[PDB]
Amino acid sequence: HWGYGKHNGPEHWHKDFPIAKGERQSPVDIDTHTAKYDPSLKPLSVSYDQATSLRILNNGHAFNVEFDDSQDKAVLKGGPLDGTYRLIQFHFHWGSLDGQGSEHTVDKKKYAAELHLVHWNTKYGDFGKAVQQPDGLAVLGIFLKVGSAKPGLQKVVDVLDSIKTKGKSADFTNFDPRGLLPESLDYWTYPGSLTTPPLLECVTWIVLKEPISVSSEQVLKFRKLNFNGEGEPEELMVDNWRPAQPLKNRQIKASFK
Ligand SMILES: NS(=O)(=O)c1ccc(/N=N/N2CCCCCC2)cc1
Numbered sequence: 060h061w062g063y064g065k066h067n068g069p070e071h072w073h074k075d076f077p078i079a080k081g082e083r084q085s086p087v088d089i090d091t092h093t094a095k096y097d098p099s100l101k102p103l104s105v106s107y108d109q110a111t112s113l114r115i116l117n118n119g120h121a122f123n124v125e126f127d128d129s130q131d132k133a134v135l136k137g138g139p140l141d142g143t144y145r146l147i148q149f150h151f152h153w154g155s156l157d158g159q160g161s162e163h164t165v166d167k168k169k170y171a172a173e174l175h176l177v178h179w180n181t182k183y184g185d186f187g188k189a190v191q192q193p194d195g196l197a198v199l200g201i202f203l204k205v206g207s208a209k210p211g212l213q214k215v216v217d218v219l220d221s222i223k224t225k226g227k228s229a230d231f232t233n234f235d236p237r238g239l240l241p242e243s244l245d246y247w248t249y250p251g252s253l254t255t256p257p258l259l260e261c262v263t264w265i266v267l268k269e270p271i272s273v274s275s276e277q278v279l280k281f282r283k284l285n286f287n288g289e290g291e292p293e294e295l296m297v298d299n300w301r302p303a304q305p306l307k308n309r310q311i312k313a314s315f316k
Pocket residue numbers: 175177187190198252253254255256257
């Protein structure tokens with residue numbers, strides 16, 4: 060099966076999933092000088108005050124914090140979006156070292172990690188139907204740099220020892236994702252894809268310019284997770300990021316400056 064190992068990583072994915080070589084793949088390098096400011100872009104509206112987390116899951120490629128998406132609660136709207144996108148899960152990608160880990164890059168700069176808040180367009184009724192549409196998902200991407208701790212991340216970090224290995228889950232209620240948001244909602248946006256198989260071309264990407272800082276100790280605990288299941292040979296869950304893909308016929312737009 061696909062993964063991030065020595066034999067099944069991103070450069071192999073195209074054999075099982077040929078849209079890996081498609082026209083709107085993610086992530087990309089954000090060349091900041093060529094992104095154009097679009098005065099028609101609206102402020103992002105992030106309304107997470109009623110978000111209801113339920114569980115955290117090691118899915119073998121990352122960990123997902125899952126939400127109740129059966130009511131109109133945590134939604135994302137505005138920005139470049141038409142309509143209303145509901146939060147279903149968040150997860151991260153990260154490196155073996157602080158100098159790599161992000162999926163998007165900024166002028167070729169890699170960050171230590173990247174948070175993806177995944178939302179689906181309510182017009183399609185559920186997530187599984189949304190991923191089949193060109194405007195089905197909106198993923199809010201947030202860079203992580205290593206410096207001062209993020210206090211609103213620590214609840215996630217501390218539960219990680221309970222989901223060390225693939226398939227493990229733990230109840231995870233009352234987690235407030237507002238504690239993961241940088242001060243500014245300035246962003247870049249472009250049309251792209253899921254960054255893991257099946258690599259579907261269904262995402263409006265919204266990448267915040269301002270990173271969040273997390274501590275070395277916090278990111279070190281991400282790197283103690285395992286890709287393998289319990290009782291299998293230990294493979295640390297590190298470098299679970301896809302490299303930048305060709306921009307092809309795409310423009311990245313900036314909400315600022
Ligand atoms: N890394 S990412 O945010 O682009 C992302 C978000 C969500 C994803 N969910 N993928 N699934 C795809 C198969 C269809 C339904 C199950 C979830 C995959 C990748």
